[PDB]
């Protein structure tokens, strides 16, 4: 369950990371290079994280919930795919809580 969730859970951490780069790419072309501090740099980071943030959270939040139904599985086959569904759901629900905090 973990091995499967990994690729999914990192990709939602990066979407913010490749983007902040771009909101730091923006301030470059706009203003002066070789100078910036915390106030402007952490705000552009906070800004970078909030516009495309929730949709990534919802994307991940949409992923975890959508897979849940395989908990519906019964008897023997369910005991098998039980832990696969938990661990996956935890990792997504893990990275999700991680991407925000």
């Amino acid at each position: 369950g973990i091995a499967i969730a990994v690729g999914a859970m990192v990709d939602a951490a990066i979407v913010m990371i490749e983007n902040a780069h771009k909101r730091l790419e923006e301030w470059q072309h706009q203003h002066p290079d070789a100078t910036l501090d915390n106030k402007t740099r952490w705000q552009v980071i906070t800004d970078a994280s909030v516009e495309v943030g929730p949709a990534l959270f919802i994307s991940l939040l949409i992923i975890t919930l959508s897979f849940i139904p395989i908990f519906t599985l019964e008897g023997q086959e369910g005991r098998l795919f039980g832990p696969l569904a938990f661990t996956k759901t935890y990792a997504m629900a893990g990275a999700a809580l991680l991407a925000i905090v």
Binding site: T46, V50, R79, L80, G82, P83, I100, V101
Partner: protein, 39 residues
């Protein structure tokens, strides 16, 4: 919501510095096996 977490930015690190140390501990302790009991 994200903006609250960044506020107390040290509470998230210290929280995290534990989520990893403690998790690492309960990772090395987690019992092994091949398949969830299926019987």
């Amino acid at each position: 919501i994200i903006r609250r977490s960044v506020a107390n930015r040290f509470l998230v690190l210290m929280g995290a510095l534990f989520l990893s140390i403690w998790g690492t501990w309960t990772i090395i302790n987690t019992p092994v096996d091949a398949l969830p009991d299926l019987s």
